[PDB]
Amino acid sequence: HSHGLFKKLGIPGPTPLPFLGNILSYHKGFCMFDMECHKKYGKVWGFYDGQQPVLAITDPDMIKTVLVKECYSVFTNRRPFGPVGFMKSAISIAEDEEWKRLRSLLSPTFTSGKLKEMVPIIAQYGDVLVRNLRREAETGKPVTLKDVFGAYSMDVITSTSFGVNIDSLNNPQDPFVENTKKLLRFDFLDPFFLSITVFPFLIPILEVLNICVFPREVTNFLRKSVKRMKESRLEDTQFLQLMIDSQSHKALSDLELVAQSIIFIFAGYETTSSVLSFIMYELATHPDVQQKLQEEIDAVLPNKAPPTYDTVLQMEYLDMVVNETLRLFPIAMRLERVCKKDVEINGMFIPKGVVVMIPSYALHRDPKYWTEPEKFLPERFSKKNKDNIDPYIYTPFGSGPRNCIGMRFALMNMKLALIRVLQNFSFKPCKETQIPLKLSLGGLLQPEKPVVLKVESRDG
């Protein structure tokens, strides 16, 4: 019942209730709680996720020490959630030297050179995305962005990792499509996870009953799906193909190889489509930003020319529109690290087992670093204004050795989708569009109502 930790230390924060802690304050969500705590407590504050003491830091020097400097020795592991089970072998969940092994062995997969070879693969789905969005625009009916971008994101992740050319939108009942679509992003403010946070003693009980956080139906499917394509489909000798090539400390396990595949699908599907939905909302509400972006795409690629690896990186304003969307809408919301030993960083003392939190959303909207944070201004990320942006304040893909391994991959496929979509179409606010768009009160950064926009074809 550790509740007098921040009182003894002299760190401010909200008054905790027995057993529950400060979970009642989450009725507004993770984002609204951090924004309110940052304004009344200041630079450093502490709260309780049931019985778990969580310390939040906002100083850039402290963030650098937690994420970059004292990473390998002190802040190596993330917060342990519900009954993970077999999936404990996944890069994002794995802790200590186990993670070090999986990081080094999976680092050459996300190289700049290997990303060039992945470019023509996701390019064929860019045409498919345009082909599918054409029929939805020809009708004149309102277009649901998450379904269109989701279907695109679904066939992009499956294609990069062994065959599966399957048109996800036109084939919604394919064994691969339907099962991978069931992989729902974990909401940590739902009744299940709230019970796990308040009662951590339930985790060993659920682990012995084989009750897993990840759905049993999909995990059993993907394990046998990966097993058959590795052998039965391609037995003849000449992300999955890159992993088979890798199969100091190697020894890649077949069970671990399955866990890594589920993670790339999980991180790929839900996140890419959610960011792509947020960006198109901002481009429709600001037609001047959309026109300027469409003028830049045509300047680099004349007469609807297909994009390439070197072409994507050349576009300045495209990067500015992506960066400003991720600024206003960081899908991660928070950056957490567990303190393993009693140490002190930049004067501030950190005990043991205390979850060190970095409130990305709150820091991304801090008036001390951003001029008019509520407003969407891509001009912040221009060659002249980019110097003013602190790399430890703006963290959409994190920082240090435990940062996003697929940040270059996610950016590449999102921009490639944006290029094709804006080359052939113009986006305008529909009759039932929420202006201003209000975020969900749950544990997921997504809109309250799905983003619906009227899509007009660029001269059919």
Ligand code: HEM
């Ligand atoms: C819009 C797209 C994405 C965003 C905004 C995003 C964001 C993040 C963030 C904020 C983290 C946490 C880093 C930290 O704790 O400091 C993270 C971790 C990670 N992301 Fe992404 N990510 C995205 C897409 C992806 C994709 C497509 C992949 C896979 C190809 C991926 C794989 C990972 C992995 C494996 C980690 C954990 C790294 C580790 O513990 O070593 N992410 N991502």
Ligand SMILES: COc1ccc([C@]2(c3ccc(F)c(-c4cccnc4)c3)N=C(N)N3CC(F)(F)CN=C32)cc1C
């Ligand atoms: C596939 O299912 C998941 C696996 C790991 C994590 C995540 C997580 C958190 C935040 C994130 F931002 C991402 C993420 C999302 C998209 C791409 N890459 C990483 C994953 N990874 C870890 N270690 N934890 C422990 C936690 F902090 F208690 C809660 N959330 C996470 C989240 C989910 C949904």
